[PDB]
């Protein structure tokens, strides 16, 4: 009978959480933001087309100098490009051709990759030998890696398909804390600007706000009908946007613990693969499976623009730290820079 | 352009040449994906043919790479899309499991669970034009067990002789009736541990798939 009592208590707690969230909903973003003029029509154009990949591109990350770019392809290749002159700076072969994530260290010294091999490979770029060699092979997950991000040069946050996330110390090579509480595979990560908290979306139609240092699930947001594939964080760290396969993007607030905005249209029936914000937070860019990307007004939920330069599924998006350009990568083996 | 920029351009050209050479080398490659219920002789078929395990071998003048994905006990629709360009799927089923059940089954059998996986794979979004090679493993024990209750538990609607041939034919027909794409074909084979000439069958099936795709491309069909 103890299990029944605990389940009833859990239901009562969920009802209390719902009641608490209801009282805070004294408005909505679309109503408060009705006093500001729209951004108008934004027509972005392709400035660079980065060729060289011979297969699908699965991940892409920008450097902190807004000039270097890293791309991962199922050919078994990571490529570090100069975004300005289209030159190829580095070509790192991989031990496993199945790569679904990549990351660029904030200091510009290290890169990361991972995939179905259940191993996160960290490569060092600044070496005395002149080549790029494997610095670490972090192992300990029981599933594929969906996203990996750097907190510093010795700490990395990974999310895997074994319904968990991990915080790895690179030098030791062992987990410092493990985040559990999801019931399904975790697909995306997004680090807060101050690197003290992060957000993790999973296939159980939920997202969770985790504290890095305490190793505990601070908050749990729901609302999506299907699995969440991509997640991103507002520049101030007080909001985050999630993309699912319901052809719907959702903007949540950390402080109010309530869903704020829903971006969806009747003419869109394809899922979202990558979500990114602008520097000022006014634009929200989301790549869809319909071979294109859409730019929404993040405060009024209007389709401000469409980028339609790809021939297959757009798998990765990125925005430079200075907000100068937006990089898109799709399964047609090409990277495009839009300004 | 300064001298350093010219040297950077030369380095980029060298990188591009290396990538093109690697792609040309990878062009001669036949990729296959191995799937099964997990106890249908997948390890046995791997031994005969010789996270994710890659098996390389070379038969006649072709280089086969088998992808065994059985440790990825997670949602299929989140990582199966990476195998969209696979040439073929080798699906392993156990005939001797027609009445064999597991403690976790809860009144279900090996059948109605392997057939469900076959139906999911055949009707998959990414595998509308990917042919499937089917191996009816453990034919000997299946034939020995059907002396009593020949396909009476798994298929109540079956009516025919208590012979291995007709029961295997009915099961194979049930497996082949799951294909709804005119461009997709299912190649069937009945194997056992004592029949090790199972690699020539895969070679011939791959050749037929390649010829069919080439003829579709040329429009001669």
């Amino acid at each position, epitope marked *: 009978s103890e299990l029944d009592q605990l389940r009833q208590e859990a239901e009562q707690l969920k009802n209390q959480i719902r009641d608490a969230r209801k009282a805070c909903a004294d408005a909505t973003l679309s109503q408060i933001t009705n006093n500001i003029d729209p951004v108008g029509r934004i027509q972005m154009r392709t400035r660079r087309t980065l060729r060289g990949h011979l297969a699908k591109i699965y991940a892409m990350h920008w450097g902190t100098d807004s000039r270097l770019l890293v791309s991962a392809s199922q050919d078994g290749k990571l490529i570090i490009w100069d975004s300005y002159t289209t030159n190829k*700076v580095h070509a790192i072969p991989l031990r496993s051709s199945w790569v679904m994530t990549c990351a660029y260290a904030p200091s510009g010294n290290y890169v990361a990759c991972g995939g179905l091999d259940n191993i996160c490979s960290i490569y060092n770029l600044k070496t*005395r*030998e*002149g*080549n790029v060699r494997v610095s670490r092979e972090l192992a300990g997950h029981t599933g594929y890696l969906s996203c990996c991000r750097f907190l510093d040069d010795n700490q990395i946050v990974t999310s895997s398909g074994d319904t968990t996330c991990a915080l790895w110390d690179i030098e030791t090579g062992q987990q410092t804390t493990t985040f559990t509480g999801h019931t399904g595979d975790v697909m995306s990560l997004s680090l807060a600007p101050d690197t003290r908290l992060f957000v993790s979306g999973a296939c159980d139609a939920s997202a969770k706000l985790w504290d890095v240092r305490e190793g505990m699930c601070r908050q749990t947001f729901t609302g999506h009908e299907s699995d969440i594939n991509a997640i991103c964080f507002f520049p101030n760290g007080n909001a985050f946007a999630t993309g699912s396969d319901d052809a719907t993007c959702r903007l949540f607030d950390l402080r109010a613990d309530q869903e704020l905005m829903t971006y969806s249209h009747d003419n869109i029936i394809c899922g979202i693969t990558s979500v990114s914000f602008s520097k000022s937070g006014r634009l929200l860019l989301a790549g869809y499976d319909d071979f294109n990307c859409n730019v929404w007004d993040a405060l009024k939920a209007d389709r401000a623009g469409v980028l339609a330069g790809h021939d297959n599924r757009v798998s990765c998006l990125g925005v430079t730290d200075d907000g100068m350009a937006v990089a898109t990568g799709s399964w047609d083996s090409f990277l495009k820079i839009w300004n | 352009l*300064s001298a350093e920029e010219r*040297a*950077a351009l030369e380095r980029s050209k060298a990188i591009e040449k290396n990538l093109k050479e690697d792609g040309i080398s990878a062009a001669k490659d036949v990729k296959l994906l191995l799937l099964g219920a997990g106890e249908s002789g997948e390890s046995t078929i791997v031994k005969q043919m010789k996270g994710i395990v890659e098996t390389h071998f070379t038969f006649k003048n072709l280089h086969f790479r088998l992808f065994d994905v059985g440790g990825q006990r997670s949602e299929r629709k989140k990582w199966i899309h990476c195998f969209e360009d696979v040439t073929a799927i080798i699906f392993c089923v156990a005939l001797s499991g027609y009445d064999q059940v597991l403690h976790e089954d809860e009144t279900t059998n090996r059948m109605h669970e392997s057939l469900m996986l076959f139906d999911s794979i055949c009707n998959n979004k990414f595998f509308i034009d990917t042919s499937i090679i089917l191996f009816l493993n453990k034919k000997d024990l299946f034939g020995e067990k059907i002396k009593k209750s020949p396909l009476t538990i798994c298929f109540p609607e079956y009516t025919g002789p208590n012979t291995y041939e007709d029961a295997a034919a009915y099961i194979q027909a049930q497996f082949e009736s799951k294909n709804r794409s005119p461009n997709k074909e299912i190649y069937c084979h009945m194997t056992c541990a004592t029949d090790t000439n199972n690699i020539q069958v895969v070679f011939d099936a791959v050749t037929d798939i390649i010829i069919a795709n080439n003829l579709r491309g040329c429009g001669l069909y």
Partner: single-chain antibody
Amino acid sequence: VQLVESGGGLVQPGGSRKLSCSASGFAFSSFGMHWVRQAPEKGLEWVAYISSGSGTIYYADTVKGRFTISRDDPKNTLFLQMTSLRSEDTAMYYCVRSIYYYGSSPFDFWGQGTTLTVDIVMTQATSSVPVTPGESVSISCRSSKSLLHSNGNTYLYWFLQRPGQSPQLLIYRMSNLASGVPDRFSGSGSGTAFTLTISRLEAEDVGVYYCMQHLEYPLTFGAGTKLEL
């Protein structure tokens, strides 16, 4: 991380020699190589440059058509074949490693070199500076034309050579600090006038500091400023 040169010595006029350099500890096939000459009364003088493969080969106007650079990636060995030497070609040769990409630090590692006996002008303001330990010093150099390219880079290099040592890179592109060099050294300037500032002078800073232009070949070195206690 190691370059060993060999093949130098005394050669009679009109003869031929072959200097060689063996590389160990780095991916020699991915690095461009330079031969740089130093005479007792001339300072540093660039001899030749060979690219990462067998492409761009550059020679100085005083040696073009007389020397030949060859490369052997499998054995990681570089060769300089010299014919018809004169009293002018008496100097010490240094093999300089140099990798070129965005963010690279060219001229980072210098071999020991071997001693053999038989359009942009860079000017050093002073040949020596009286210095004392624990004080800050400034060394000034001038160029005949602006080294600030349109892309914002200023291709000026500051190297250090202590008595009995091969030069090591101090500053590349007039502002950056090479690996292994403490934050004591700094650099600034604009246009054609540049200044290297040493905030705190130690015993290891005594020696000759050289300026190099790398905007377009040939690369010209200055006379060199000698800081001595």
